[PDB]
Amino acid sequence: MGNWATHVYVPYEAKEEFLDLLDVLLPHAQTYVPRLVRMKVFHLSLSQSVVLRHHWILPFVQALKARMTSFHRFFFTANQVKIYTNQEKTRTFIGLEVTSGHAQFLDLVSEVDRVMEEFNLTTFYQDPSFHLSLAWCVGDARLQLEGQCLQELQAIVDGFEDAEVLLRVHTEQVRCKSGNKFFSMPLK
Ligand SMILES: Nc1ncnc2c1ncn2[C@@H]1O[C@H](COP(=O)(O)O)[C@@H](O)[C@H]1O
Ligand SMILES: [Cl-]
């Protein structure tokens, strides 16, 4: 029944405050790169996007659930704007990089990585930069977005007052997308 795109992540609850901040941030970035498009759903990756044989989807999800069930929830901060590209530099992303909480994300990834290895899937980047992507475009737009634009985006973020949105975000769940299927699991 096919091989399915499979990706593990921490869902980020995009509250109105957050989406309203993006209503300021994104047009600002679009003055440099108009073709940026807002993300539809917001996540912090714990795995690469891999491909997994259909009959292993449910077993994979169960393996993840068992490990995540024991993993304690934690707080993180994601308020540092950073530009990412995919590996081929055919997509560029504006993200909010995690600072405080990064070590807890590393611990999460260590558990996810074990599952990846159990299913012969690629483990996460060895130099991970955990982040919430806010917008993306085709191509390599680093030259337009880094420097002045990034500085201005950071200034907007630095000026934003609700700590719960970016400064003290509580992880609640992990999710695995496989194809068009989404499997949620609570952290402890
Ligand atoms: N050090 C890194 N850690 C995590 N993702 C990264 C890193 N460098 C670049 N990225 C890329 O960031 C892109 C967007 O990330 P995501 O929003 O998690 O899908 C992915 O295509 C990753 O390859
Ligand atoms: Cl453009």
Numbering used by the authors: 78 to 265
Which of the paper's sentences describe this entry?
Usb1 is an exoribonuclease that shortens the oligo-uridine tail of U6 snRNA, resulting in a terminal 2′,3′ cyclic phosphate group in most eukaryotes, including humans. Usb1 is a member of the 2H phosphodiesterase superfamily, a large enzyme family containing members with known 2′,3′-cyclic or 1″,2″-cyclic phosphodiesterase (CPDase) activity, or 3′-5′ or 2′-5′ phosphodiesterase activity, or 2′,5′-RNA ligase activity. The active sites of 2H phosphodiesterase enzymes are characterized by a symmetric shape with two HxT/S motifs centered in a catalytic cleft. We report three high-resolution co-crystal structures of Usb1 complexed with RNA, which show the structural basis for this catalytic preference and unambiguously identify His120 and His208 as catalytic base and acid, respectively.
In order to visualize how adenosine binds in the unperturbed active site, we crystallized wild-type Usb1 with the substrate mimic adenosine 5′-monophosphate (AMP). AMP bound in the n pocket, with His208 well-positioned to act as a catalytic acid to protonate the leaving group 5′ oxygen of the terminal nucleotide. His208 is also hydrogen bonded to the backbone oxygen of Ser206. In the wt–AMP structure, Ser210 (part of the HxS catalytic motif) helps orient the scissile phosphate by forming a 2.7 Å hydrogen bond to one of the non-bridging oxygens. The syn conformation also allows a water molecule to hydrogen bond to both the AMP N3 nitrogen and the non-bridging oxygen of the scissile phosphate. Coordination of this water molecule may help stabilize an in-line conformation of the scissile phosphate. Comparison of the AMP-bound structure with our previously determined UMP-bound structure shows that UMP cannot coordinate a water molecule in a similar fashion. We also observe that, relative to the UMP bound structure, AMP makes a shorter hydrogen bond between the hydroxyl group of Ser210 and the scissile phosphate. These unique features of AMP bound to the n pocket may provide a rationale as to why the enzyme is more efficient at cleaving a terminal adenosine relative to uridine.
